[model samples]
Target chain A: SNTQAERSIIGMIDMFHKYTRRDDKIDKPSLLTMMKENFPNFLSACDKKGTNYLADVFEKKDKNEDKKIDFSEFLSLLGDIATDYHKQSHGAAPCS
Target chain B: SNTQAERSIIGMIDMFHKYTRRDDKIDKPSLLTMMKENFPNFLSACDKKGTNYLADVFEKKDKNEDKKIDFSEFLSLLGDIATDYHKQSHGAAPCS
Candidate 1:
């Protein structure tokens, strides 16, 4: 078995590929699907926070306005998730 | 225990903080210390490949060529480690 970091990174790339159909990048719908599956717990916080992060993911991550999420764009999402976990680790619990 | 992704992200952030002292950034010595401890297995591959990745890590990640690594620089290191694991997962055992 791989380390947690290994699995996390591998799963992330795999998640992107699993959702990417026609192109090397992920389209809006596919990105949403993967996010819901991989980060449901991460997004659960938004409900109580009154934040519509899921709805605005594409617009925010698509820095190039290409409507497709490239690898770099996807990494940004990971960074955000990590930031949340980092905050939670310091006793924030973010899920509430 | 947290999920793989959650743990991975949290561990990374924790690693950075562990190495940082008065400042929020990790200096060269601290970064190397954190990397070796957090990613010994991940870096083990580089030795066999004749790729002095460890030696060049700071050079590659210190995007601004500054001596200190900020949070963003630290994540780039994670990205590279993730890339290696992703490749290994696809049957390309990066380790020699």
Candidate 2:
């Protein structure tokens, strides 16, 4: 019986740490691993489209050029994922 | 029993439609209402800091200036909230 925002916020914090170290920043390799585990559907879709969705993702998301993804950067990643799915729901941006 | 990503992805979908109309696009009033309900903590923090976080939110997020918020635009709001919280955790953005 939790609010959706509360559950979403808590879930993101856990997901951030699952792929991060004590500082709560995820390195590139860990980011990739997390994507492989959590985004298999997207991976497949991107692959079918012959486009690399995760490619250059780290560099693109590292807006500060810090070479690591902090929690904020992590949320940006999730935002993109959520947007893609939203487009899918609208019958826009077909999966592959 | 549930992965963080799964929970978060699902939570956001539910949250999106809660304040939306039958067509699932929230007009200005509904968007403002959603913010008031889901973001009291952030609102107070911003208020104490003398900054109105929700001010211009609709304009800023309406990339197409569509006068309404689709699910994708809705996620952007959540992304911004998550980013603010992340900064707060780092003690970068004081709750003021």
Candidate 3:
């Protein structure tokens, strides 16, 4: 199941790359490719619904409309997701 | 004597700034101004001879011909001067 899910997520990356090239106004597919290649397990966990969740989050914060998240925005989203994931898996820690 | 030397050095900064803007191709005069305003004593220590010595160092190392040294080059020169000054004032310390 894990390997199949990982492959599916990898396939989605190719899809994302195709979509990205079709629209130059969007961010370089390189970012997505990097994330996909580097963090396949994380990608598998996200699945299609997780993908939509990420898309919505990006859409809400995409100020430049460049389709690619800039460094600051990307880091912020990652931080938010990490916090949420930590809370879901482990008890919420104090926000010191 | 010190104050006069300090003022002379401060005046030289203004002169350098004017030279910089007239050229418009070098670093912002803001860097020189900050150093002059903040390190008047150090500036004063470098009298005409000292300034000429500094100029010779700059001429030897300046690769870009921008007339203003980049951060790396400036820091290297400062490090050399500081080490030399330290050795002259307090013999050689053990290198860590």
Candidate 4:
């Protein structure tokens, strides 16, 4: 009986856990896999538009420089993606 | 044809815009409304346990103290909620 918003949030959490490893963190490859799987449309749109948005996302979002994405880092990654989509919703380019 | 993750992100964006005013932000009342409507399950669970989580959510999440929640602030709010759910998934209390 979850609401739409609740379901959405749970979806995000499930997706995160789907990619996390034994340490409850995502490695670079896992992060890439996650991007390809969960963000196919966003990546495809950016690809067609000639911008490789995820090309350096790992380095950028790995704020602690631990070479792995913990839950907070994962959320930051999603925050950035959400901001991009939010901008696109406000008339900005897909990767701009 | 968005993926599950894309759909979830879009849902979050849509929810935010649904409550935002002309200034592209959510005021206290709108934030409360959004919480009540979108987080009914979370709020109900917390209330049943005598923990009023949303009692000061607006004051807490209004990081800039501008009396409004912009897109970034809104993301923070969802991040907090997601964290709570994430913790619950790991066997923590609902509002802990």
Candidate 5:
């Protein structure tokens, strides 16, 4: 019975928790799985352009070079994807 | 059908587009309406805590001091809310 936005937020949190270790962070393999499962369309778009964003996404988002994605880093990743989707909505190519 | 995350992202984009002006930014009044419509539960939680967050949220999120929220600012707002929810998931208070 939650609002769509609320559901979205909760779903995002749930997805993060689902992939996190006991330390509440996602390592590289888990991050890859999370992206593959949760962002198939985005990856497919990247695939179409031969961009292979998933290949180095862990390095890009692991800003502290910890090799683990904390919640803040996860949000940053989401923000990047959201920005791309926003651009796409404005008629720009995805990931271009 | 899209994945849950995809739907969530699309729903967020739709919600923002729904409230944006022709300039693709959200003004104060529109921001207020969007918050009321999309964040009733969060507002209710804050209301139970006697914190009228809505009173100054526009000021909080309009980081550029432009009296308007662009898409990047909007994402930052979402990131804050998401952070709160993340904390709540870890047993913190709603606004603490």
Candidate 6:
């Protein structure tokens, strides 16, 4: 039983390595697919135009030449943009 | 511009604290609601029995005697269980 657990942990490490590699060039359809996969309800909130707009925003934020943002970069970009937008919209009471 | 941004940042900090508090006891309906709200398509994929089973699992994992899980505890518990189950499924392997 313990042996099996150890084997499974090794498998997890292998899986992590396989999963972390990014495919080059995030196309519009791919981006839409990703949003649908990870956040279906959030995607539903956006209309087609809004979705396209979001895709454009994503493209703008992908500053690295790799054509895909890694996880840390994506999170940083999202946080910065969200904070900036929230500030602009809510005035002094951005949180409110 | 600077003044407005500063005010907004303060507002965001205030909002963060206000939103971070956990409400007591996750009722079945509330868990279901959260799942449906966040992952509508994923929720749709599950049968009624499956949803109930998942809710029960969440209840079992909230072992701190607090009816609700705080963010850190919730994340840690989820991560640990997920890792353990994944290891069980895949068989733990030794590090090279």
Q: Per-residue CA lDDT of candidate 2, range A1-96, in tens?
A: 435675567567666778887767899999999988877767777788787877888998998998899877887888777777666766776442
lDDT of 1 by residue, B6-94 (tens): 55566678767888767677898888887677676677777778776668888889999878988878887887777666567558878
How good is chain A of candidate 1, measured by TM-score? 0.85
Model 2 lDDT at residue B35:
80
At residue B82, give the lDDT of candidate 1: 70
Best candidate according to lDDT: 5
Badly placed stretches (over 4 Å) of model 4 are: none
Selected candidate, larger DockQ, 1 vs 2:
1
Q: Please say which candidate is ahead in lDDT: 1 or 4.
A: 4
Q: Which stretches of candidate 5 lie over 4 Å from their true place?
A: none
- lDDT tens digits, residue span A1-96, model 4: 999989988888888999988998999999999999889999988898888877898999899999999999999989988998999999998867
Top-down TM-score ranking: 5, 4, 1, 2, 6, 3
DockQ of 5: 0.87
Candidate 3 CAPRI assessment class? incorrect
Instruction: Output the better candidate (1/4) by TM-score.
Output: 4
Which parts of model 1 are misplaced by more than 4 Å?
Answer: A87-96, B1-3, B86-96
Candidate 6 versus the native: TM-score? 0.30
Instruction: Please identify model 6 stretches exceeding 4 Å from their true place.
Output: A1-19, A22-31, A48-51, A80-96, B1-15, B19-96
Clashing residue pairs, backbone N/CA/C < 3 A, model 6: A6-B92, A6-B93, A7-B91, A7-B92, A7-B93, A8-B91, A8-B92, A9-B92, A10-B93
DockQ of each: 0.43, 0.33, 0.01, 0.86, 0.87, 0.03
**Deviation from native of the Cα of residue A94 in model 4, angstroms:** 0.9
The best-first sequence of candidates by DockQ reads 5, 4, 1, 2, 6, 3
In order of appearance, the predictions have TM-scores of 0.78, 0.70, 0.28, 0.97, 0.98, 0.30
Counting only residues 3 or more apart in sequence or on different chains, how many pairs clash (N, Cα, C under 3 Å) in candidate 1? 0
For model 2, name the residue pairs that clash. none
| C-alpha-based local distance difference test score of model 1 | 0.75
